[model samples]
Target: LVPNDTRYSEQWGYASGVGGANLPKAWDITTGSDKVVVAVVDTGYRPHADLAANILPGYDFISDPDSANDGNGRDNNAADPGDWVTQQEVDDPNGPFYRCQLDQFGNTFASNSSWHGTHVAGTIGAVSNNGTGVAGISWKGKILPVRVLGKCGGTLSDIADGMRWAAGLSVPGAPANPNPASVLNFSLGGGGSCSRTYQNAINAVVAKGATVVVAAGNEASPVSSSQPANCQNVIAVAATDINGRRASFTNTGSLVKIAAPGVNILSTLNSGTKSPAADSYASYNGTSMATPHVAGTVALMLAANGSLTPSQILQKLQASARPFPSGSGCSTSTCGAGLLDAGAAVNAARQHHH
Candidate 1:
């Protein structure tokens, strides 16, 4: 379904594979089929062939009358949710132009969010070589899908509920999952300060042992860009290019915790919708993709030490992460500690267990 293209792997330096093989000896340990779970809260997923084996049965959280299922969920169903505004290179002189549209919920004009959830899912844990299209960080992590946006987007209420569900938090009438997600990845972000409603909900999940990873927003501003990323205790991940530099659109500040590979990376797409001739592997770049790499790495860290508390896990992530040349992981900014180093993280987790 995906071609091992040079647009990402070659031109840029994002070819990290399942275990950060670019540097090869970055860390040591085998993933060994240890399956971890992560909740992908964004648009719904209709699995492409390459990703089918790695997909987990998850609920959609779209606030439509459909109630978060197929268009609403991804249960061997036909229709899928999420939309992209079609456009031509009108602004630029037939160059790299994106005809964008406004958000589905917000009235402001902006670029399309696409099947952002699914694409982000692929980047984090796309199923490493059973001899396939792409490679994700954790070779055996399971993805839990929860759709929140349609065209515009869903609400804080829906997202909060989705976080609870991912944590196996009991919501009225919702079937409880005893096997709580070890990590939750929220790739989407909204502008504003972090709400107590939002933070409390995330806090509850984190309290239940699930490490939440949120995008530090694409708005390359100070700590004032978006919510949740600005939230304390959560993994507020910012975008970094393949060579370990921050991506152009990444929102940075004293609040950002860590950085990850968020460059022009390839991931699974809605082959069921977009013309099959179109690329099955959609190339995306953002802190969105970066967030999941952390989530997947966290899952691996947890697998290495199922006894590690949420606080301990966070510590391991920071300790194993590669330090930025930029002073003390951002001096007084949000880029705490430094870039996320998965191999180092996994090895550290193993060491903790040992």
Candidate 2:
């Protein structure tokens, strides 16, 4: 019971409710250990009072000259440079993708810098019991903020390479990451089955002894088409609301390894735009929010037993998830094992005798 931050009461994911991950019980065994490192690969992050001390050195992997937006390609600075898209560009008939504001399906509205990686990072390893803001899943583990997304979004190629680099694998042109992550968190994805490139990357990372955890996508349909999430050997996570019901935006199907709190979930954020950005916090929804819960859980397991293989961790997590509450609208077939239970998984990891 560290941090006891005022906002802890708002963290439904850490309590004993529908979407809660039962993290309090897990912390009873162990808050976490510095031996574990988790990589947050998304829009990137800027330093925050609540998260700076736990952050490790990270790199930016946005390859597109325009999307990188910082007048450079890859760099050592993983700090987010604000990913806000200009409405004029969205309306520019001569702009990229014919200046479309809506996604390919013409249903989703996209805008502004999301500071996606920072929020996800906070969830996994924000310093806890520190008498500050929200409590993180891992009290002692560190986070590597890898920037893969910018502007509208990032390409799969960049994301794949980011994965490799984060796991301390070799990547052409990018400097070596001195701190290799034990777990890699991909809180973003797009349509498509596992590609040869993504599959190769996933295989490579797992070989490097890193477990890959991914979001199940927010399409609210079969995750058959979601890459990285559908990719082989990942712990694909679905979104659940405060009541433990599936979030309407979450992708489902057998691909989902488990569920976690995602709806109206609160975490760190920025004050929009690259310049004049300010540290802030807010609640946002999507499978994006749910992905880190599982990633954070993996950090806990690693702290308990650092030798567990990626496959072993995946199996243990699935086997230990708490059963879904009644009327949660998810069967074993659709929601994977069930809601994530941090307490169960960590205990299982500690007792594995390996």
Candidate 3:
């Protein structure tokens, strides 16, 4: 049941003729598992019709009262309250938060509620073969939405605790997560090496049998300078375009574990700010988009082998990675293992035992 969703063919990560994840073959092995939980630690979720079936109860971990935006802090509500940065804030000389920034080539971007986590969640597990929206990587995978980001971005402290809690670790104040995740998606990070805070949380989760995957960042430079991506024990994912070429904006380095399609990725989205204006679908580009491909793939792998450890998951994914089609990027020293090959990895996972 390859989906008949109108945009299904547009998801190059799943079906590019040149180099994709080879997902259709993997689906033959198994579409996904409801028992395998994934945590999306990002802006947060929206009440999307396509994604709600897979989303479990998640928490809002934005500690700053201002960024929380829900008139409260650390509650059970993980729904995104809209992170739109108004033009008023942009022009405010005394604004506590500045809304936009310049890129390397000097491009200006204004802030908007990206509906970021919603898109990521949809990629991982937005109910496939139902003939609705786009097909998810793991058709029946479970999602635990962890709200660690808000306007502008999120703090490392909040993000760290969110990670810990997602893996079922105890975070003081926030109540215990009823649903723990086996795979954690840290799709948002910045210009820095792995902080101790980030490292400690990652270590704890890995020890608890959760595999973490992080975006290698969109800085178009070496990934060594990026946090969590460069963090030890996490699968660092870079982005390739539909042609299997390195995405123009994806950071590169030996630290990147695998690459997945990131350009023009169509997935679920929200039609409004602060609430559900409508159900929507659109394409986006970034290492942020690429990261979920790996996360959902990991969930599929675990569905094939529940006993596989974090280290085992990493090894299988890297070892089974298909080499990037020529002209993708870098020699063996860079671009990590290669482009992610979901069919190969899942087959390899099926052959492995705990």
Candidate 4:
């Protein structure tokens, strides 16, 4: 049942290879179930023909009105109004996001909106076999777009709350999520140790039987240097290239639980530079791109066997991972168990149910 999606061939990571997730084979076993939901916690998501059908209603967890960029703080709207920051806004002392562009190194920079969550969501559950756009890892899993990042980036508080809410935990002021996810994907992180805020949120979600998958960061440093990804009860994923080599920008270390193809990964995007425009697709590189591959695989696993615990899912994923290709410049100690094998993982998951 090869997907008829026009861009399916462009998704090299879904094929059989050291770096691929072997998702095409996995799809044969189970294209996924709408009962298994995956929460994409990031810069929110935009409606795209390739992704809209699978997207579920999600919450905006950005507490600051200025950062929300939606004229208010913490509403039901999870739409990404665009996270682009302009130099003019950074320079304006009276601007809502004044000095928001300054980094810890005292450097100021501006950027276009990444439409990051849309891409990540598309990777996880874009409409497949539609004779249209790209195929997703899990063709039927629903996506819960939890918006936490905006402007410069999201705060730890908002991020933590978003994670909690995504798993259906009670948030202080936000409404409860009706469609709590079985899997949560965090493609956004910052430089820091795993704070109690992040750890607590992760703990709560994992306790609720939700598998959390996070990026190892693109810092080219140890995974411990990043928050959330460094947190416990989460699958911290590193990045591998199409050649099976560790991606040059991906963080690595003993803490990384798995690796996935990240280089030039193609997915949904927007034509807008600073705001919403036309639907589009583009190639992106980072552990950010790598994380959702694992997340989408988890959704497939859960759809195969919902009773599997978070730990069991992690163990199966690691055990079923493919070893790095010879001369691929990655070892278990650096790139986790190995590259994610979606086919093997899904098969193992279904076997557990029997």
Can you write out model 3's per-residue Cα lDDT over 1-354, one digit (the tens) per residue? 377776788888997356588888888888888899999999899878888999999998998867777788788899988887666665566765654445567544556678999999999988777777898998888999999998778889999999999999999998888899999998899777789999999999998889899998987888998998889988888888888888888888888888888888999998786545788998999999999999999999988778788888889988988776766664445676887888888863435468
User: What lDDT would candidate 4 get against the real structure?
Assistant: 0.90
**Residue pairs that clash (backbone atoms under 3 angstroms), model 4:** none
Whichever of 2 and 3 has more TM-score, that candidate is 2
Which lDDT tens digits does candidate 4 get at residues 194-277? 999999899999999899999999878999999888998899999998889999989999999999989989998999998899
- Local distance difference test scores for all models: 0.64, 0.84, 0.85, 0.90
TM match of model 2 to true structure: 0.94
Looking at model 4, residue 236 earns an lDDT score of 94
On TM-score, the leading prediction is: 4
The worst-scoring run of ten residues by lDDT in candidate 1 lies at 18-27
**Per-residue lDDT for 211 in model 3?**
89
User: Using alpha carbons, what is the TM-score of model 3?
Assistant: 0.94
For residues 1-354, what per-residue lDDT tens digits would candidate 1 score against the true structure?
222422334313234542132322221354423456877877766566655566676665555543332333323221244354324322333532232233456433433436677677776566565555666655566777766655445678778888888788976546766546878898887878998878888889988888888888886687566887878778888877655666777888877777777787677765434322232677778878878777877766766666778787778877776666542224325565667776676653334353
| TM-score, one value per model | 0.80, 0.94, 0.94, 0.96
Instruction: Quantify how close model 1 is to the true structure by its C-alpha RMSD in Å.
Output: 6.5
Model 3 stretches with alpha carbons more than 4 Å out: 91-93, 99-109, 273-275, 348-354
lDDT sort, best first: 4, 3, 2, 1
Decoy 1 TM-score against native: 0.80
